[PDB]
């Protein structure tokens, strides 16, 4: 699983992030792990 702040896939499974949440970055136009 990915650390907080690391790039993730919006439509991916939330378990891709260790935090269990893939969220919009406020500035960059990517999703990152919560």
């Amino acid at each position: 699983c990915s650390p907080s702040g690391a790039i993730c896939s919006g439509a991916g499974p939330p378990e891709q992030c260790c935090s269990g949440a893939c969220v919009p970055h406020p500035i960059l136009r990517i999703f990152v792990c919560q």
Binding site: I7, C8, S9, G10, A11, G12, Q16, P24, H25, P26, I27, L28, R29, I30, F31
Partner: protein, 223 residues
């Protein structure tokens, strides 16, 4: 893309999806072996997906090619977002056709007022989350350097430009990063950043591709 429209299958044949399982960034095919994207889209084990429309359903025009090289601009500044550009080399040359095609690099920079086409599979809502199946498009003008710097005081470098609408409602959004801004047949921009999506007085900020033509050429020639 927020406030945009359905492009139509393969009507943007230079648009690629950067994938590591699922879509995470956009990119632009600039020749049979090379893709341009954003430096903040960097990660290991990238798969490039060409000829895509509905990214969830095999429609028959796709090509799935692994990245062999992912080269972030060596002067990329993660603090200021300056030089937010990355070059991806494909393990094998893509088969170019009517539905998978390269986009030309600009020979000169574009001017304010020029309408461009921005595209991607990113969020379609400015508050909340909604992921499209198919590719979405947006027509947007390039804004004056003054209006850009007014929108983001002290944060716009000479290698960035604003495009979109100061009234909000229409913008690129999260999931669109790395994707194309194409103006009069030339790749002029890379989806980079902004303050939220489609917010008033906060248009999209894009990497100014015309300032990187030499680096792109040198990198290709030497890799």
């Amino acid at each position: 893309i927020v406030g945009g429209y359905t492009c139509g299958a393969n009507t943007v044949p230079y648009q690629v999806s950067l994938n590591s399982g699922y879509h995470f960034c956009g990119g632009s095919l600039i020749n049979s072996q090379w893709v341009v994207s954003a430096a903040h889209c960097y990660k290991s084990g990238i798969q490039v997906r060409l000829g895509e429309d509905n990214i969830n359903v095999v429609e028959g025009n796709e090509q799935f090619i692994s990245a062999s090289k992912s080269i972030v601009h060596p002067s990329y500044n993660s603090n200021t977002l300056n030089n937010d550009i990355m070059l991806i080399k494909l393990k094998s040359a893509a088969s170019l056709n009517s539905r998978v095609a390269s986009i030309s690099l600009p020979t000169s920079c574009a001017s304010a007022g020029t309408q461009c086409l921005i595209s991607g599979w990113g969020n379609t809502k400015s508050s909340g989350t909604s992921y499209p199946d198919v590719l979405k498009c947006l027509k947007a003008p390039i804004l004056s350097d003054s209006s850009c710097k007014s929108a983001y005081p002290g944060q716009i470098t000479s290698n960035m430009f604003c495009a979109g609408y100061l009234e909000g409602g229409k913008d690129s959004c999260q999931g669109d990063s790395g994707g194309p801004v194409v103006c009069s047949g030339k790749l002029q921009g890379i989806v980079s950043w902004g303050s939220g999506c489609a917010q008033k007085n906060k248009p999209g900020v894009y990497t100014k591709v015309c300032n990187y033509v030499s680096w792109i050429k040198q990198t290709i020639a030497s890799n």
